[PDB]
Design a protein around this ligand. Structure first.
Ligand SMILES: N#Cc1ccc(N2CCOCC2)cc1
Length: 209
């Protein structure tokens, strides 16, 4: 059972700008997604200080990077706080409505796409390199869900029947045909060292076989 939703208008406007603007510095998408994972990890870490049972769904706090050349996917997995159904349908869009608006006004006042994270909307940089993004997520207080969008103005949410995650978020980037460099081991390592060397959780690259 799949429900389809319209993006908030400002978010749809930003996603169309990201897909259609010539901008060669696409590697920042990985910094932005890792930063989002770090924020999610901070949140469950903080909550666990006063309620240790919040880690019953998994004590390890980490980020895994999983390239798959056969599927042309790059997957970013974290064991952070996860997202509820209300997060997926209402809350994140409400917050991104205002941040997207500000970011676009900034893009007219000298800013470039690389400052997107200062407006809290770094997630959408995924669409620099992905034609479709699937987000599998599990929050302690809700069931496991799959969110997905190929942009174009809409996204879907469904309960997820796949492998249970325990707790956290898995962002699956279905890469554009000309963006497969982000599946290469040495390219991912270079980007992580360049942009994400100070993240306070272990980032593990899964090597393909
Ligand atoms: N309008 C809206 C809206 C925008 C973004 C998202 N998400 C993006 C990140 O993954 C979680 C869900 C959901 C709804």
């Amino acid at each position: 059972e799949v429900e389809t939703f319209a993006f908030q208008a400002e978010i749809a406007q930003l996603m169309s700008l990201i897909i259609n603007t010539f901008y060669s510095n696409k590697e920042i998408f990985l910094r932005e997604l890792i930063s989002n994972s770090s924020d999610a990890l901070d949140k469950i870490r903080y909550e666990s200080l006063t309620d240790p049972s919040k880690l019953d769904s998994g004590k390890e706090l980490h980020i895994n990077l999983i390239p798959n050349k056969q599927d042309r996917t790059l997957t970013i997995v974290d064991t952070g706080i996860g997202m509820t159904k209300a997060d997926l349908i209402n809350n994140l869009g409400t917050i991104a409505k205002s941040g997207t608006k500000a970011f676009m006004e900034a893009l007219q006042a000298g800013a470039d796409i690389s400052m997107i994270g200062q407006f809290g909307v770094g997630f959408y940089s995924a669409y620099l390199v992905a034609e479709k993004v699937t987000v599998i997520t599990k929050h302690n207080d809700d069931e496991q869900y799959a969110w997905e969008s190929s942009a174009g103005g809409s996204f879907t949410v469904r309960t997820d029947t796949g492998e249970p995650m325990g707790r956290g978020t898995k962002v699956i980037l279905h890469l554009k045909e000309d963006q497969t460099e982000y599946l290469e081991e040495r390219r991912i390592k270079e980007i992580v060292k360049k942009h994400s060397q100070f993240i306070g959780y272990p980032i593990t690259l899964f090597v393909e076989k």
